[PDB]
Amino acid sequence: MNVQLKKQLAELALAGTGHHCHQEAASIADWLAQEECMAECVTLIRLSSLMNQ
């Protein structure tokens, strides 16, 4: 919801890619994608998910 919480979800998603939680991370990634200021953020999550799959 609020930016601070959103950043917590992104970190959570990043943590998820390293625990075989690619579906969850993807759900988070696509929602954050809705925002322009989180571009790179979703990038890493996805890149992290691509590398761990």
Binding site: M1, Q8, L9, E11, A13, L14, A15, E24, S27, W31
Partner: protein, 60 residues
């Protein structure tokens, strides 16, 4: 590789963990009653929040 978050959810910070979980559900309730077009957006947000709740459990 590992974040500071993962270590705060693994038992080292019980209070932080339940505050984070608490607001994530709080938020979930907000968007869920919001969902009662623009639904796919909010529904997308509901998925993201629920997703985070799934990870916090898979890594606690």
């Amino acid at each position: 590789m590992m974040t500071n978050l993962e270590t705060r959810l693994s038992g080292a910070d019980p209070v932080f963990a339940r505050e984070l979980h608490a607001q994530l559900v709080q938020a979930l309730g907000d968007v869920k009653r919001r969902l009662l077009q623009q639904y796919q957006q909010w529904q997308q947000e509901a998925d993201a929040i629920e997703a985070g709740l799934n990870i916090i459990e898979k890594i606690k």
